[PDB]
Amino acid sequence: VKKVDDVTGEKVREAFEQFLEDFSKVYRAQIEFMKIYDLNTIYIDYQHLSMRENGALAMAISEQYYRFLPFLQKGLRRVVRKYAPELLNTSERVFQISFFNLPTVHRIRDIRSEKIGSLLSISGTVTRTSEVRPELYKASFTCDMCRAIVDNVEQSFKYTEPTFCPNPSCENRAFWTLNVTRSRFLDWQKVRIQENANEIPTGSMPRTLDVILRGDSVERAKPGDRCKFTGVEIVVPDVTQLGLPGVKPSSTVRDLTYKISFLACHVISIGDQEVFLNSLS
Amino acid sequence: LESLSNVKANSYSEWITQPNVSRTIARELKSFLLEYTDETGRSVYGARIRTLGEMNSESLEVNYRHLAESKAILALFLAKCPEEMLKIFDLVAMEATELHYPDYARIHSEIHVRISDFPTIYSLRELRESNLSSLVRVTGVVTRRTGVFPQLKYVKFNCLKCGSILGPFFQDSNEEIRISFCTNCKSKGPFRVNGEKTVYRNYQRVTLQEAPGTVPPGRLPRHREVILLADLVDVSKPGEEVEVTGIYKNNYDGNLNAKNGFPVFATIIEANSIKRSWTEEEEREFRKISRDRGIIDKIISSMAPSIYGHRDIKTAVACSLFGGVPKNVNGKHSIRGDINVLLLGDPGTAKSQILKYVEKTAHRAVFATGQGASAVGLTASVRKDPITKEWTLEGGALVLADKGVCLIDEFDKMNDQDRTSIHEAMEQQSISISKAGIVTTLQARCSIIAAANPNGGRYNSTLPLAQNVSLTEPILSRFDILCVVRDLVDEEADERLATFVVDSHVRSHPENARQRRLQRQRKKEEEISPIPQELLMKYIHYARTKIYPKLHQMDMDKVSRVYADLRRESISTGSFPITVRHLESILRIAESFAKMRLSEFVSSYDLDRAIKVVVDSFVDAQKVSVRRQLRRSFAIY
Amino acid sequence: VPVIDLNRVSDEEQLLPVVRAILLQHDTFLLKNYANKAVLDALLAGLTTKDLPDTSQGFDANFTGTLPLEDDVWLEQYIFDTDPQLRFDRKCRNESLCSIYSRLFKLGLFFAQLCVKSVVSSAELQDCISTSHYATKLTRYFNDDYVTFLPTGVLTIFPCAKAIRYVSIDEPDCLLFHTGTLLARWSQGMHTTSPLQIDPRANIVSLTIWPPLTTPISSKGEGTIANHLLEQQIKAFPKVAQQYYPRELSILRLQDAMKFVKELFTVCETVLSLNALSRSTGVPPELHVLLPQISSMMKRKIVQDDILKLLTIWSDAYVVELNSRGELTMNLPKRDNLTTLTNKSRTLAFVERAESWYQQVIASKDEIMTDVPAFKINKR
Amino acid sequence: DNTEIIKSFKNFILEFRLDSQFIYRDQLRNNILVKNYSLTVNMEHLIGYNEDIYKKLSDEPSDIIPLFETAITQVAKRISILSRPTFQLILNSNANQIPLRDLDSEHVSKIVRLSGIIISTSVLSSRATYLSIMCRNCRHTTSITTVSLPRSCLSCGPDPYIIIHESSKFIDQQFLKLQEIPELVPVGEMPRNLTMTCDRYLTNKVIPGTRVTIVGIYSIYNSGVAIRTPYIKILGIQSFTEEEEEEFLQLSRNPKLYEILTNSIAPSIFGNEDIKKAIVCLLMGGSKKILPDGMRLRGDINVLLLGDPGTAKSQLLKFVEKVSPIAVYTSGKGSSAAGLTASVQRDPMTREFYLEGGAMVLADGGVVCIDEFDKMRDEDRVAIHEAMEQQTISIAKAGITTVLNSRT
Numbered sequence A: 001v002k003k004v005d006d007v008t009g010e011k012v013r014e015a016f017e018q019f020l021e022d023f024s025k026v027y028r029a030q031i032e033f034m035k036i037y038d039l040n041t042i043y044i045d046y047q048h049l050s051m052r053e054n055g056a057l058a059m060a061i062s063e064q065y066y067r068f069l070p071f072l073q074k075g076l077r078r079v080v081r082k083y084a085p086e087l088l089n090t091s092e093r094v095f096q097i098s099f100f101n102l103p104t105v106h107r108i109r110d111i112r113s114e115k116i117g118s119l120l121s122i123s124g125t126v127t128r129t130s131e132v133r134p135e136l137y138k139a140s141f142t143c144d145m146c147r148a149i150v151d152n153v154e155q156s157f158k159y160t161e162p163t164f165c166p167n168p169s170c171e172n173r174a175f176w177t178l179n180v181t182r183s184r185f186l187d188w189q190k191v192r193i194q195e196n197a198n199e200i201p202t203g204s205m206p207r208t209l210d211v212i213l214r215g216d217s218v219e220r221a222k223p224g225d226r227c228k229f230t231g232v233e234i235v236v237p238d239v240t241q242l243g244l245p246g247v248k249p250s251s252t253v254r255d256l257t258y259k260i261s262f263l264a265c266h267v268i269s270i271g272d273q274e275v276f277l278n279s280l281s
Numbered sequence B: 001l002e003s004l005s006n007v008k009a010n011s012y013s014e015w016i017t018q019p020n021v022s023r024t025i026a027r028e029l030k031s032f033l034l035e036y037t038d039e040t041g042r043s044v045y046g047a048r049i050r051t052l053g054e055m056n057s058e059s060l061e062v063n064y065r066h067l068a069e070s071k072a073i074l075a076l077f078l079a080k081c082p083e084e085m086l087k088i089f090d091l092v093a094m095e096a097t098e099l100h101y102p103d104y105a106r107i108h109s110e111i112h113v114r115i116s117d118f119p120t121i122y123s124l125r126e127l128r129e130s131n132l133s134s135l136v137r138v139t140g141v142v143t144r145r146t147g148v149f150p151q152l153k154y155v156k157f158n159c160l161k162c163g164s165i166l167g168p169f170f171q172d173s174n175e176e177i178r179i180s181f182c183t184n185c186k187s188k189g190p191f192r193v194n195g196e197k198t199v200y201r202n203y204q205r206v207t208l209q210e211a212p213g214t215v216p217p218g219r220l221p222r223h224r225e226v227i228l229l230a231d232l233v234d235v236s237k238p239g240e241e242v243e244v245t246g247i248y249k250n251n252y253d254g255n256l257n258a259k260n261g262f263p264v265f266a267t268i269i270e271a272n273s274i275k276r277s278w279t280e281e282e283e284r285e286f287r288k289i290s291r292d293r294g295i296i297d298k299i300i301s302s303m304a305p306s307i308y309g310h311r312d313i314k315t316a317v318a319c320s321l322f323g324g325v326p327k328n329v330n331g332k333h334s335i336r337g338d339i340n341v342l343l344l345g346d347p348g349t350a351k352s353q354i355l356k357y358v359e360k361t362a363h364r365a366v367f368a369t370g371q372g373a374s375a376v377g378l379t380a381s382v383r384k385d386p387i388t389k390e391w392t393l394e395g396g397a398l399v400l401a402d403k404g405v406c407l408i409d410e411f412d413k414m415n416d417q418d419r420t421s422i423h424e425a426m427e428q429q430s431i432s433i434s435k436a437g438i439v440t441t442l443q444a445r446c447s448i449i450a451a452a453n454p455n456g457g458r459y460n461s462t463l464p465l466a467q468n469v470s471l472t473e474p475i476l477s478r479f480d481i482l483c484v485v486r487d488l489v490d491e492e493a494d495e496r497l498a499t500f501v502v503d504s505h506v507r508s509h510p511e512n513a514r515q516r517r518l519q520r521q522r523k524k525e526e527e528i529s530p531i532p533q534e535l536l537m538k539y540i541h542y543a544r545t546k547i548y549p550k551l552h553q554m555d556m557d558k559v560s561r562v563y564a565d566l567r568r569e570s571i572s573t574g575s576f577p578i579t580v581r582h583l584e585s586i587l588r589i590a591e592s593f594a595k596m597r598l599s600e601f602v603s604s605y606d607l608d609r610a611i612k613v614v615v616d617s618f619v620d621a622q623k624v625s626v627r628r629q630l631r632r633s634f635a636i637y
Numbered sequence C: 001v002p003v004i005d006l007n008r009v010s011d012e013e014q015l016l017p018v019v020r021a022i023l024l025q026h027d028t029f030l031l032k033n034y035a036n037k038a039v040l041d042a043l044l045a046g047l048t049t050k051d052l053p054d055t056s057q058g059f060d061a062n063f064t065g066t067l068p069l070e071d072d073v074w075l076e077q078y079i080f081d082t083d084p085q086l087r088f089d090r091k092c093r094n095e096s097l098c099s100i101y102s103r104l105f106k107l108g109l110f111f112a113q114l115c116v117k118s119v120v121s122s123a124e125l126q127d128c129i130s131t132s133h134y135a136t137k138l139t140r141y142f143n144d145d146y147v148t149f150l151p152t153g154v155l156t157i158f159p160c161a162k163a164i165r166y167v168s169i170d171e172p173d174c175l176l177f178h179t180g181t182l183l184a185r186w187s188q189g190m191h192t193t194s195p196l197q198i199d200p201r202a203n204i205v206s207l208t209i210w211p212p213l214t215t216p217i218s219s220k221g222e223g224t225i226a227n228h229l230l231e232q233q234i235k236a237f238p239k240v241a242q243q244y245y246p247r248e249l250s251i252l253r254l255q256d257a258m259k260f261v262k263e264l265f266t267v268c269e270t271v272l273s274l275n276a277l278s279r280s281t282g283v284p285p286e287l288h289v290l291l292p293q294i295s296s297m298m299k300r301k302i303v304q305d306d307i308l309k310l311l312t313i314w315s316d317a318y319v320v321e322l323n324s325r326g327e328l329t330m331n332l333p334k335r336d337n338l339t340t341l342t343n344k345s346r347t348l349a350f351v352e353r354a355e356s357w358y359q360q361v362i363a364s365k366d367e368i369m370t371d372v373p374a375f376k377i378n379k380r
Numbered sequence D: 001d002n003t004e005i006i007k008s009f010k011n012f013i014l015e016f017r018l019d020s021q022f023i024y025r026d027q028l029r030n031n032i033l034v035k036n037y038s039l040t041v042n043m044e045h046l047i048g049y050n051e052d053i054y055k056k057l058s059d060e061p062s063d064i065i066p067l068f069e070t071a072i073t074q075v076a077k078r079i080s081i082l083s084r085p086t087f088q089l090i091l092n093s094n095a096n097q098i099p100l101r102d103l104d105s106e107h108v109s110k111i112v113r114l115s116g117i118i119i120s121t122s123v124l125s126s127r128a129t130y131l132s133i134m135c136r137n138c139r140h141t142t143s144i145t146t147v148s149l150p151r152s153c154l155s156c157g158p159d160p161y162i163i164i165h166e167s168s169k170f171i172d173q174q175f176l177k178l179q180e181i182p183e184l185v186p187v188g189e190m191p192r193n194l195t196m197t198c199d200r201y202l203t204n205k206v207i208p209g210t211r212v213t214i215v216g217i218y219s220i221y222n223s224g225v226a227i228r229t230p231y232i233k234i235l236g237i238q239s240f241t242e243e244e245e246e247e248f249l250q251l252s253r254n255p256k257l258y259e260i261l262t263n264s265i266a267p268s269i270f271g272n273e274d275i276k277k278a279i280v281c282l283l284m285g286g287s288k289k290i291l292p293d294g295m296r297l298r299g300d301i302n303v304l305l306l307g308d309p310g311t312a313k314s315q316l317l318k319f320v321e322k323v324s325p326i327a328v329y330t331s332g333k334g335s336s337a338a339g340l341t342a343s344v345q346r347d348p349m350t351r352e353f354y355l356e357g358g359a360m361v362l363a364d365g366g367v368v369c370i371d372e373f374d375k376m377r378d379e380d381r382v383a384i385h386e387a388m389e390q391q392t393i394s395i396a397k398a399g400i401t402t403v404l405n406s407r408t
């Protein structure tokens, strides 16, 4: 039994690891820096990502970012075992990537369904924030009929029990025991940003949006600040679509409502002489 | 076995859970409880165990340093798998107690051992995923307290398809356990908890909030939830400041996975031990300054040194920070101890920036503004419990400032109703409420420092104070010291004040590096202050905790005749409501001066400073034509 | 504190079982309804108001006389021993003090015998204290901040048990009986004692009881009981010991410094162990970060200078390389982070190094300093 | 085995003799004559009559009190047959009560005694006690006396039985709310509230604001992760030393009694003899009288302090709070008409709307100390007018109206 292989993803990861081993190796120095300082997330400049293969590597990574993420995660976390295996230890292999420095800064005014799944950066005034919470990034379960264990049970945007007991000697399904120790969790936070005053013409009204922050990038959002985010747009189920006019599709009955949200992996706020001077040509 | 537990085959949880390892460390623990090397003090733990059975309690406090000194890895396992170590330690303690007092299991189920003196402390803003399931020590303020309700501990189920009873399951307070397969039937049918064979516990949920003076600039107060179990309930009440050591775990599993995007949980702390303290190097350093001749003028000169003049106002700040003696006379009578101060005068006289200094100096300070504060937001608020759906109360600014100070800016400009609720706090030091079925009283022991403006924005020196402000005699009566400020014009006064301020902006302006720059800061403190500011904060704290000067009625004629004299001159003049409450300020402010010297006795000199400050206040707040006459009438004082 | 009442417990068959039970659990007990208590109260008033100490007596190497102290406090002390081999010629000058002393010694000597008979299993020393053979010290504070003291006797007697702390004692009508080090030492583990805290300016008279001081501390040791009391008096009064025992005071004072660095090393082991397990990596933390936590464990202020003393005694204790920030650090030397057997071995290693280095200093003919010099980390 | 428990109970009713009389047999016989199907058993007689059954009842009343109901029913019906329904058990006891804060997870299913004040009551509801059912598939009939209907027929598919309504029996039940005395509650704490349930003859005896003594069973029931709401099955509710009586009688015989007590009121303050004496009159209060038309004269003495600030007027109220056995202290600003007087709120435990008292309801039968009386709103004053001049509070909220007495 052989599963389908994504040849484009394999090509991307091969180009991804080759970029990591050749970029000058400041990023590996950052990798060693993370091992020294016990860090979780590595940060990569987009323009650094966009200066290999004339930037075509970034383009494929950008427009289909949500698809290709695991390949880059494998690409790096193989490198960490190659050069900093201690980061794999615990007291387990939590690892994150957070990009930044995008050229385009799209407005809340300019959200299109075409942008779903692509990498984009936006800017908006914060109005409300949520308290930080742990997010079940990856879970694991132990069987109920027998006592086999299932690891690396990823929860992609929903709660998901394992669909089978791996050993054919057992027939357990839809009945599992959740581990709270071998499992792993990650930080989580919601930010409610608002369209800037200079964007909305007179008479028009400000648009509002909810933005998700996870990892160490949480709590870098404070009310009243002009924050700037970087990430990808992802849709989530909605409950307020009921009662709207027009024919609504159905699943078969099951509902298929959606609403637009933006997920951000990096946080920064727009604002000592020599610090400012060197940033200009 | 022995010393074989140090082998690390896998993560610490993979090694402790092994029964052979468990027996080894359980055997290893049994030696520690019975014998410990405390030299002349013998094995105090045996005495601790023996006295606990005598006292009939479950609180075996265990010092971290003792176990860490004797048993290296046996203690370090408690810092990474505290739940596992505490599970077996209870059993080891249980048998140890029965050696001295057998049949302890007859009345007591378990020994809820308490860890103490744990050396690593984290704030509520430090907890991360890396510290999950560990043992953590935090300090905070009890804001909201829920009731006491039972919770399951060991759970047994009855199968619906057979009469058999399922085995016991420990309730982790993490998830409402729901089994899926019967042991006998192997069926997935219904199950119900067998209440007649289920062991409960006591559960109370308490909220801890950052200390008022520790909130970072420009952020809401971070706060967490704490789980008190096993007779750890009712250890603290609203307004108390506590430090607690517990386990940092996650238990909010439910609709959060769907009601909010993606599966997320929420964090709690399961408290193990809680506590609501000076080395020799501190007290010995205090007494050196204490023996310095004339210490009172050193403290007063150090009250916000970057403000020129206003010495008869800085003394009120100095006296209020130290406070008096909250004399609960014979129990049946009570008198407030803290000194209330009202700052009044023209704009441009630093009536507010001083209140931006009392906040940074007093141990616990809550700051408020006149129009930005509401009556409900100051005294107490009403909430519904998210777990038990009951009416609960949450403390306000005054409740937070218990054993501290409350700072109100622009006291006059607030609406009348918001100003009205303050009346009880300034005399009762308590909040009385009756709302939505809640009938109770809280503790609001806090001095109030208020800044205000006269009617029209300028002080009319030709009119009485009672006519210069929109307030009234009642509100003014609850104050002890009133600091009238005149912005009169004079070249000599202006030259001295301006040359002080122009130098203040020179120094407050920016310009082993830690040590070198910390030297520079205390160097500038020496330029302007006779006392280093860090010590003064501690010195005030030490005085408030240890010093309670007593009284001898030697100067009774001196004070009584002053009281009679002040009353006589206010019989027909628009002035302060000089009453018995105003006399008490003289004695209490005398206590502060005595408590500045760390003396235990109210000397004649202390009243001499006390009478001069109190009498001068009444003289200064008079019309011009009358002020010059009382200037000479009270020259004796 | 247990109370002994002569109205119901005054016979030897009554006192001995009671004293034995008290001393197996406690070190201090009270005497009630003594016939001389009423006279003692009158005698105390005469001493504290009329019979003031002879301030012109001076003070001697025998730690007897009227020693002037700080805050104009005077201490009138006398020592008496039956054995003439010790020259305690400076007998008590005031008869009212002797009146209290005789009354205390009248029943206290029998009680001192009771204390020895209660817990001391040595058959050779059952009657080590008696009328024929006894040694007593008369102590009297005087004023013309509690002081921690530990008498070296078998039993200590106070005519009034008030303002005495160990928790305070508020029983003026009962005499205080406290056991010293010698009874606990000769108890063979059956009884132990603890030091007390008293007001040094309360004008309180006190009495302590030994067998004749020429008796050795134990048959296992060469020094006599007088040597043990001499060491305590040298430690208690450095100004007196400066003229007569300069080197001895330096030797005795240096022992406390050794205990300082030993417990300091123990604290560093605990703190550094927690720091290793709290991180996924072994990078050494900077010293200034650890010091606030170190001082909390020590319950007193600890700075860089005290830490460097550990390096002088044991060079292989830690790795203290200076960080690129220019800040000192410290870390465990062992390549594998820690092992409970190696932790004890390294703790014993410092103990052996310090003890040998202590013996090296005391064996030197030069006069001895009472502190460990600090190590100098190689500057970069 | 359990027949001995029934037999021992039968001896304790038919044959137990006190004061040379069959008190339990006679009082049960008198109840039968009254047709009151209940018996008041005194626990102090039970311990003196048979300690062995007391051990079982005190420790495991799970089966004993079912035996109590069935044994008394058999014995009482035997008496009825001799002279010419299920009899409710009522327990009267004088044993020591456990503090409401002292209830823990150890007294589960144990009979406990409590004392407190009712703060809210519920409306009556009917609960089944005897049922008869019929199978819908085959008309098979049977009788049934928590209880759930059978899943299969005894002769039909799952759950084949339906209830025969005209041949079934039901009993009434009430839900009560109890909390500890606020005087016994230290400041900074809200008194703990406890849910109680009563049925049949024990219902509607107490209104909100009534101080009671409780004998009941401590237990829990599901309604947090596993936080079950505690509740009490009510078994019996009741609502000075000889030397103390002589001591206080001697106090009444003191020649300077009036002046001594007058001085005793706030001795820390000087003079003020007149205001002290009026407050003394406030402590005693007047004597109640009832008009022949049925109206009641208000016996409370209400006094207003209306003087200059700084005259210890606030301290005078505080001292009364510490001397009045029933004392409530509240400020004018931090009070509301709903907070002061009665209110209607829905109990989340039983999902029903309960009538709930307020501060002016808790202080019934005692003294309340209100401060800054001028600072409270007129609506609060208006509600006070009814309490002051009629000792009643009328509630009209949502869609329900009621009147509640308040002797404050």
Ligand SMILES: Nc1ncnc2c1ncn2[C@@H]1O[C@H](COP(=O)(O)OP(=O)(O)O)[C@@H](O)[C@H]1O
Pocket (backbone or CB within 6 Å): B306, B307, B308, B309, B310, B346, B347, B348, B349, B350, B351, B352, B353, B354, B451, B501
């Ligand atoms: N006596 C003084 N010494 C130094 N600075 C002063 C003094 N009085 C006023 N100031 C300055 O004037 C300002 C007064 O601010 P504020 O306290 O708001 O005035 P107000 O008295 O109206 O509250 C402060 O910034 C302070 O620097």
Ligand SMILES: Nc1ncnc2c1ncn2[C@@H]1O[C@H](COP(=O)(O)OP(=O)(O)O)[C@@H](O)[C@H]1O
Pocket (backbone or CB within 6 Å): B335, B427, B474, B477, B478, B580, B581, B584, D268, D269, D270, D271, D272, D308, D309, D310, D311, D312, D313, D314, D315, D316
């Ligand atoms: N006759 C008196 N004897 C003793 N203390 C008094 C007397 N009159 C007033 N006081 C003092 O007044 C204070 C109480 O005043 P209070 O009634 O609270 O003022 P207000 O009327 O503004 O509420 C107490 O601290 C008390 O010591």
Ligand SMILES: [Zn+2]
Pocket (backbone or CB within 6 Å): A143, A144, A145, A146, A147, A148, A165, A170, A171, A172
């Ligand atoms: Zn399986």
Ligand SMILES: [Zn+2]
Pocket (backbone or CB within 6 Å): B159, B160, B161, B162, B164, B182, B183, B184, B185, B186
């Ligand atoms: Zn089954």
Ligand SMILES: [Zn+2]
Pocket (backbone or CB within 6 Å): D135, D136, D137, D138, D139, D140, D153, D154, D155, D156, D160
């Ligand atoms: Zn049928």
